[PDB]
């Protein structure tokens, strides 16, 4: 009974530490008016007419003095509103229901979380996708909660309780999900439904917890029916992140996705493992199907992750190209220091402010551009699939 | 069905890759471990003197013992392997650990919070304990059972061109329920440091964990689902090892439960990061509940205590706060030593080497980094060993 003893001491500690984070409780990117001209469909002249015409109508743009005078400090919203003023339709004007993206791989360390949060921020803030005025939701279903930490400033969530796995069991309305479970991330337009280590116990007793709280409901269609379907009209993209564990969460995530992206690692051994997952994927969809709901899983796109020039890497890259063939993204996430440094302070290569960044400013830009290139390639891929 | 297409091509590629690594399967030769001592260096070890070593060495050669000398100098030099030193201690009559205890002792370093250093501690503990200068006379035999589909332990313990893929895994051994002779011949693999072995894991074990109930029903009818590891694997190796370490992933599944039911003692690595620490505490506060669950539904846990230790601790002030909190929680069950965050552990982890198996000459970094990592690892291992000794004899 020495555990009971220590376990209690740790309990008083939690209740104490929990009242810490509670008692505790921004996007740097701004564009100079002239900078908008490099954005698609916009020119120096038409931005001047838009800003001019909108102002005369009562619009007020963000500004900040650079010495004495006061220039324009355009926020993403200002830009989005300028495009709207110029009759450029938004993504929601051609697609009516949210598309669910699931970056998955049973093998860990392959960059599932980083590629997921990077894709969320980079798609929203992509210079070429701002006109799309995208609304993105990242649903964290990994008790390790890496996505949560990356997306909402660690001093925010700290000890989370309103969890995605909780949402699944509580089965609440759209309004409650937006108001009580979903929290904003640093980049406006990108939200997150958090996770917490406590979700490990939920996954562990999923079977029973379902019989108690969701009687008669197919245990594999919960995330899809109790959460995603209720939010389909408030978001353009919904990204689900789960751990590399063949859980109820992994299954619920698979049953709700429209598309899968498999991040492929460069080392031969990890690449080998990943192919095992890609090979048994149809087996997994078959199971979930044979016992409940059907997976609307269209395709499975692969892409190299943390790739480099090592001979071994080039080799795997050739093999992956062989396996996925056409469904192989033409862009990949290379291994960069920017992603590591950022990963250490749980910040996105998009939200990380260069003025605060500890490391070379060059390295940061490189990863940002890499995240952006990756996001644009993903978005374009969905586009082709969705309008064909 | 443009998902079954890739699966097909993927499956084919596996065959190719498999047969490829199936050739480069180098044979891990024992006399390849870098560590060697000049005859004179043994004198610095406990119980050994320059004179009792020369006497021992002389008598052994008289009985035909063959020292693997090197052709250097007018008369060959003794390039002593940790095994030579072990054989010398044996010849002087100092008792080995297996002379001091009669059954393997099962250690389980665990935490539901991942990234806390469960694998690196487990792996460093094994190697550092075997090769620790003050523990050579113990002639330890250590087995690391990898039950994490990620197989990080398997990777640190062998060579990338030594184990490659993994077919006969621990999860597989649990369900097949084979003989001790079979576990020894087919399922256990040696690591880079002789004396420490590993029962491997593979990604395919994630499917086994996923369908544990159905698989136990079809392969192990009547057997309690939480006692499979204890009865089908560990109990059959009780005489073959002094220590058996179990490594599992951060999941509250069958593997985690079986490891617990087989453990003699538990070690909990506690991270300094306020968020990580808080998560670790939630795990410590639910341990009794978990043990109670296993009990209520079948077998009992012989879990003695739960020792806690700071993992990846820095000189930062923040860290010193958690350390205190941790002390309040664990109190006496806190380890006197902690695992500090060091470059040696990082650079080594990058190449899946242990700060014990990593040859300093080859280390691409600062010798001091590697040297400090090894020492820290050795002090941690001696501390765990000394603590087990006090618990075991008392
Ligand atoms: N492209 C990259 N370059 C450098 N480091 C990366 C990259 N992608 C991921 N990482 C780092 O690799 C580790 C694994 O990524 P993570 O997203 O947590 O994987 P999974 O989601 O596979 O667990 C993290 O510590 C992260 O900072
Ligand atoms: N003392 C340490 N100093 C520096 N890096 C460490 C230390 N202990 C562990 N690590 C590194 O931290 C990461 C997490 O450790 P790992 O043993 O894999 O954790 P778990 O077993 O938590 O997955 C690894 O990348 C590892 O190389
Ligand atoms: Mg993840
Ligand atoms: Mg581990």
Curated annotation (Swiss-Prot), chain B:
Pfam families: AAA_31, HTH_54. Keywords: Plasmid, Plasmid partition. One of its GO terms (biological process) is plasmid partitioning. The keyword Transcription regulation does not apply. The keyword Zinc does not apply. InterPro entries: AAA_dom, DNA_Partitioning_ATPase, HTH_54, P-loop_NTPase. GO terms for molecular function: identical protein binding. This protein is essential for plasmid partition. It ensures the proper distribution of newly replicated plasmids to daughter cells during cell division. ParA is trans-acting. Belongs to the ParA family. This is Plasmid partition protein A. It comes from Escherichia coli.
